[PDB]
Every structure is written in C-alpha cells, then in structure tokens.
C-alpha cells in the first residue's frame, strides 16, 4: 500500500509500505529518503506514537494512512 | 490581538474544560493567570495537585507565554524556582496553539521526564542510576509538597 507522512515542517513524503511491514522497515525507508536515523524518527498515527519492534498492522495502519513525523529533541 | 484572543481562550476553557486542568485570571488581570494541574495517575505524582503561574506577553499570540511552577517536585526538568525549559513554550510555538495545549503538554511531561536535559542534575542522575529509588523519591516529594 501507500502512506503519506507529514513532517513538522509540512513536508509530505510518500512511502510504498505494507500492513505487515515493521516499524523498523518504515523507519529505514524514511532514513533512506531523508537521512533521519530510525532512532531519531518519531512517528504518530491516530495520536499513538510508533515504536520499534512492532509493525504497521499493530497500529491499525491502512491504505492511504497519514502519519505525523516530529523530528525533535528534548530540552 | 492580545486581549480578544485571551478572552476567547478563557471562554473556550469555560465551555469544554479538560475536567482535570483548570485555568483562570487572578482577580481581574487578564495577563496573569493561575492554573491547577492534577497529577497523572500513571506516574508517581498520582493524587497530587500542582499550581502554575502563566504570564501572557503583550505580543500574544506571536510570542509564547511564560509558565512557572509554585509547588516543588522531584522532576529532572523542573528546577527549584519551577522554571520549565519546554520546546512548545520557546521553540515550537505558532499562533494556532492555545493555552490548553500548553497545559496538556505539561501534564504529559509530568509522566515522561527527560534526564538528558538535567535541570536538576542530581535528580536526573538518580533517574539514570536507580529507577526504583528515583520513583520512590518522587513519590515522597509528592506526598510532602503536593497536597
């Protein structure tokens, strides 16, 4: 399927992913497309922050899903 | 732009409050607000109440407000004076943000403290060394001060 991720700067990135794709796989795709390391990526869907070790289907991510990427530190 | 906006924010808070965090002007001064925050139940601050002072600058909403604590807390990101270094209140601020989002962000931060920004280095070191002792100290401080 295809998903769209909007960054805190408003940039929209399209990803060809699958429901069975792991969070690590999508983070690796985002790193390849933008250079953001997977540990630094903070993805939120439906108010739930994506975490490593799980899959998109674990977050009920479906066709044409919209995600929010917040590349931010703390402090 | 600096008074109609504040009146609108107060009216909105008076319609659908989050039922936990409250905010209101101190007497009659729309640029000085008091806020009450309930301790989250999933963090060792459970059962505690906290007080905040909010100052709205004259450049509101183009410039973020200034928030300070009033009751002490064993938190890495809350110094003795209560000053908070938060990204929303200094860096990631846009005119669309209301004053309820700041309170929600603070009530969320009271559950996920950041040790990497050790505003009190002793507390962050205790967090990074002994989590159980860290949470025990946090609960002791909440029992001592919050009520």
């Amino acid at each position: 399927m295809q998903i769209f991720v909007k960054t805190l700067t408003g940039k929209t990135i399209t990803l060809e992913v699958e429901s069975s794709d792991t969070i690590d796989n999508v983070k690796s795709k985002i790193q390849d497309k933008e250079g953001i390391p997977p540990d630094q990526q903070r993805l939120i869907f439906a108010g739930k922050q994506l975490e490593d070790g799980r899959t998109l289907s674990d977050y009920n991510i479906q066709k044409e899903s919209t995600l929010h990427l917040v590349l931010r530190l703390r402090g | 732009m600096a008074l109609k906006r504040i009146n609108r924010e107060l009216a909105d808070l008076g319609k659908d409050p989050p039922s936990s965090s409250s905010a209101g002007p101190v007497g009659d001064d729309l640029f000085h607000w008091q806020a009450t925050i309930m301790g989250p139940a999933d963090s060792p601050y459970a059962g505690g109440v906290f007080f905040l002072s909010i100052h709205f600058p004259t450049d509101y909403p183009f410039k973020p407000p200034k928030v300070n604590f009033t009751t002490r807390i064993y938190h890495p990101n809350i110094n003795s004076n209560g000053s908070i270094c938060l990204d929303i209140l200094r860096d990631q601020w846009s005119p669309a943000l209301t004053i309820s989002k700041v309170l929600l962000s603070i009530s969320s931060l009271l559950t996920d403290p950041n040790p990497d920004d050790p505003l009190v280095p002793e507390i962050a070191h205790v967090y990074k060394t002994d989590r159980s002792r860290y949470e025990l100290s946090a609960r002791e401080w909440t029992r001592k001060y919050a009520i």
Partner: protein, 377 residues
Amino acid sequence: SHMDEYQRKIAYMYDRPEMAVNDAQLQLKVSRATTFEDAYDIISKLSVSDMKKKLLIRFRNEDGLDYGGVSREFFYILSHAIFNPGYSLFEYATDDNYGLQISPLSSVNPDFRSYFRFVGRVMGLAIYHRRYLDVQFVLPFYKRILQKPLCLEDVKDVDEVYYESLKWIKNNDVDESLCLNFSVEENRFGESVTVDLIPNGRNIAVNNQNKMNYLKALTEHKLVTSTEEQFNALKGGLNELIPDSVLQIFNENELDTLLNGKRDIDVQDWKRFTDYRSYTETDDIVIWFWELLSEWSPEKKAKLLQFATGTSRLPLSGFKDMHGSDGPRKFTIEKVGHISQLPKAHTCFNRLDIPPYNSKEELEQKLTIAIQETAGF
C-alpha cells in the same frame, strides 16, 4: 574581496572635501564619574563649525600623554553610558538576545528630541573622527539610517520567535478561530492602549485575503512607525555632520564596521565570568579549553559562543550581565558524558558539557567538529 573594497570605500569617504578636519584644537574636559552629564552639557551646545575641528579630550584631574588612548576611553565610556538600557533611551530587542534598538517608552520624557539629537551628534562625531563606539545595534537600525526599505525578513534580527510566527501566518491559512485583527495592544508604564494599524482596524478580522496586508502593517509598525519622531531627531543630529550622500555608499554591514570597528569577543572577561560544575579552575579540560580560546580566530569564537549560549551577541557589559531563559545565567561548563561523545550545549542555560578528554588535540578536534553546523558573524 570584502576587506579591500571596504578600505577603498573608507579612503574615498574620508578623502571628500566635505569631511576634512581643521587645524585648530577644541579642548573638551569631562569628569570620569559624571561622563554623560558633562558630555551632554558640552556637545549638545557646540556649533557645527566647532565640531569639525580636532578633538582633544582631557579627563579632569587625570593629566597624561597619548591623547589617542584618552579619547578612545572617553568614547568607550560615553557609548556604554548613553546606549545603556538603564538610561531609558535604548533597549534590548529581547532579554536572551541582546540587540539594541530605540525604546518606544523613551517618548515619556518631556523632551526626548534634545537627547536623541545629542546621541546623533555623538555617533556623527565618532564616525567623523575615526573613533569607534562599542555597541551592537540590530540590522534594521542600520538599514533605517541608510534609508533602505524594510521587509519581513528584517524581523529575524530583532526577534526570532516573532519572525517565526509571522512566517507561519504567511505560509499557512488563517481561520476565524485565531482572534487576530488590525490592532496592536501596547503596555506602557502599566497602562495598556490599542493602536490601529489602519483606520477602524480594531473591528476588521484578518481573513485569508488580508494576511499579507496585516503582515506588512505589523512589520512597518514594529520597525518604523513606533519610533518616528525619536529616530527623525537622531538622524537629523547624525546628518548635521555627515552628509547623507556620504553615508549612502555603504550597506548595513560596512556601516556597522565603520561605527563599531571589527567586532571581537574578549576571552579574559569570558574566563573571569564563567562557572564550573564538577570542574575546578585547575583541571586539564579547563586549562586546555582556555588555551584554545586564547589562540583562536574571532569567527570561530563567535561560532562557539552561538553554539553554547544560543546567540553571538553579548550584553552591553560583557558576560557579567548575561541572561538565559529564566534569568541571569552565566556561562557554565560541566563534566557530562562519555569520552567518545562530542561536547553538548544547553542553550537556555548557557551550559556547555565537555566530557573528560585526554589530550589537547582530541579536545580541539571534538570541539571544532561539534560547532561546524553553527554559523556566527
């Protein structure tokens, strides 16, 4: 090259027949303690013909040679006195980003025009006699002196958060939820009053078809219209000596260099007004750090200062009166982290975490690598 072109411009400017000094001497005596009072008593009454003669400055009860150093010290004291925010003439743009600008409250005085004409005469005298002040204004001030149009980007120097909010309004659409309208609330001496950007401006909401006009009016009112009479008096005093046709061959940076000289960051003051956590004044990672800061170029020192504190501008009295997010927060050095990790910076507290490295070479390499993305000056 910037430096050669600037030197050519300076030579051409000072070679003009309308900017030539005379041969007679003008003795100017001021007491060291009451520098501002005597300076305003003497300068604000001199004639234009008198101010074009050679300037000889002698502090009272302080007899000595090398009058050049005496004049430089006098101008340093006067520039740190008149431009001091405590005197209610100028003010910092923001507490945590020290940039001088004309204070809108200065109109409270019954006659601010005389004082601002005195300030203009002081600046014109400094430029005319090849003497440097030591203040750091904001770029919009210099652009106003040269009479250049001011745009939205100029708000970046004044206030970063304000510029970010204005840019947000420019980019994203504005709904009716945001209670924004053509009016600015100004709080002077406690009392808050409303100023209309346009007539009947407090009853006109800013839709998506008006936000451009709203941004234009806000920028013009923040940068220009709030300081009309005061800056007009200041520029009259300045142009009294230096004709405008001479100032208008520079730009917003060459004029800054001409006024305040080549900007530099002192290291002795930095060392004297810093504090250490878990570090002592005789530790290796401190002596090596101060040696590196001693033998470094001004651009890299400014880059490090911006990396640590957050801005490359300093208060009017050095590192002593330094401010942070909360309040007075002097530059701090702390021992935090592992050897491999680069030095880290907490900008809201002016704090620099330098791990315990092993040798000067490693410290220099790590510190120069960690500040590459930061640009200063």
